[PDB]
Scaffold this active site. Structure first.
Site, PDB file in Angstrom:
ATOM      1  N   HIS A  78       0.811  -1.127  -0.375  1.00 11.31           N
ATOM      2  CA  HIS A  78       0.248  -0.157  -0.444  1.00 11.31           C
ATOM      3  C   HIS A  78       0.489   1.133  -0.264  1.00 11.31           C
ATOM      4  O   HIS A  78       0.177   2.732   0.085  1.00 11.31           O
ATOM      5  CB  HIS A  78      -1.132   0.217   1.093  1.00 11.31           C
ATOM      6  CG  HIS A  78      -2.326  -0.997   0.806  1.00 11.31           C
ATOM      7  ND1 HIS A  78      -2.635  -1.908  -0.694  1.00 11.31           N
ATOM      8  CD2 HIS A  78      -2.069  -1.926   2.567  1.00 11.31           C
ATOM      9  CE1 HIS A  78      -3.428  -3.052   0.242  1.00 11.31           C
ATOM     10  NE2 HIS A  78      -3.393  -3.244   1.476  1.00 11.31           N
ATOM     11  N   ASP A 121       0.234  -7.397   2.336  1.00 15.07           N
ATOM     12  CA  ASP A 121       0.959  -5.958   2.501  1.00 15.07           C
ATOM     13  C   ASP A 121       2.199  -6.391   2.365  1.00 15.07           C
ATOM     14  O   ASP A 121       2.725  -5.731   3.524  1.00 15.07           O
ATOM     15  CB  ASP A 121       0.229  -5.471   3.624  1.00 15.07           C
ATOM     16  CG  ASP A 121       0.248  -3.983   3.529  1.00 15.07           C
ATOM     17  OD1 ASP A 121       0.196  -3.638   1.987  1.00 15.07           O
ATOM     18  OD2 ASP A 121      -0.168  -3.001   4.038  1.00 15.07           O
ATOM     19  N   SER A 123       5.441   2.533   7.839  1.00 12.35           N
ATOM     20  CA  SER A 123       4.530   1.210   7.126  1.00 12.35           C
ATOM     21  C   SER A 123       5.749   0.645   6.059  1.00 12.35           C
ATOM     22  O   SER A 123       6.697   0.936   5.569  1.00 12.35           O
ATOM     23  CB  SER A 123       3.348   1.987   6.518  1.00 12.35           C
ATOM     24  OG  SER A 123       2.950   2.481   7.544  1.00 12.35           O
ATOM     25  N   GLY A 124       5.814  -0.273   6.032  1.00 13.35           N
ATOM     26  CA  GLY A 124       6.976  -1.720   5.000  1.00 13.35           C
ATOM     27  C   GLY A 124       8.711  -1.357   6.040  1.00 13.35           C
ATOM     28  O   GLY A 124       8.962  -2.313   5.271  1.00 13.35           O
TER      29      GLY A 124
END
Length: 228
Positions: A41, A89, A183-184
């Protein structure tokens, strides 16, 4: 990172910063010389813009000998990922060229045995994501050790009401948590990558909303196949 401290400079050589037009977007982790693992995302934001990845860094604005910006050859999002969910994800980015390795740039071993981290285990998460609720963004790398939470507890209606599949894990979020911009990134436990910080809208630092991380062991086959 919320409730965290500044990280020792270049003490996590695998730390990557995925960028969109010269600005930090998400964290990422170097898993192979030419591959960086992140969250799918994150590319949802880079819809319009050039994606690059910064390695060997500590400060995003200041010059550092080990710092290097790499261009991206291809972006491979997991095939079952949907712009409206937190499952699968993961995203794999192939760098335009193999990363020059050194003490400040080195891949991080990842988990292939599909076994849950024992609860209470303290894992390390890092990122340049926001540091408070005002949305302040650090210039240098932050981190925080967080305890892993058993799944059954993360699933209760008071927490994430059975949104946690076998492919996901949670860590505590009380005062110390990963937030937007992280994130990630990497969730390292025992010197190995156990998870990747998901990229979904979530409030930070609230102990009733544990941090959700995707288990890489559950995707060992997809990675192996993409890096093949």
């Amino acid at each position: 990172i919320l409730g965290g401290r500044e990280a020792e400079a270049h003490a996590r050589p695998y730390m990557a910063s995925v960028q969109l037009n010269g600005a930090h977007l998400c964290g990422g982790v170097l898993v192979a010389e030419q591959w960086v693992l992140s969250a799918a995302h994150c590319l949802e934001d880079a819809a319009d813009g050039k994606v690059q990845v910064l390695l060997g860094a500590h400060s995003l604005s200041q010059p550092e000998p080990s710092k290097r910006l790499y261009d991206v050859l291809r972006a491979v999002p997991h095939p079952d990922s949907q712009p409206d969910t937190i499952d699968h994800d993961l995203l794999l980015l192939q760098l335009s060229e193999k990363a020059t390795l050194g003490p400040a740039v080195r891949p991080l071993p990842w988990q292939r045995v599909d076994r849950d981290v024992a609860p209470g285990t303290l894992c390390d998460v890092a990122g340049w994501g926001i540091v408070n609720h005002a949305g302040r963004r650090p210039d240098s790398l932050q981190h925080v050790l967080l305890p892993v939470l058993d799944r059954a507890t993360c699933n209760r209606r008071t927490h994430h009401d059975g949104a946690i599949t076998e492919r996901l894990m949670c860590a505590e979020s009380n005062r110390r948590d990963s937030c937007k911009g992280d994130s990630g990134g990497p969730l390292v436990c025992g010197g190995v990558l156990e998870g990747v910080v998901t990229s979904g809208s979530r409030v930070c630092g609230n102990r009733k909303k544990p941090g959700i991380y995707t288990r890489v062991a559950s995707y060992a086959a997809w990675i192996d196949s993409v890096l093949a």
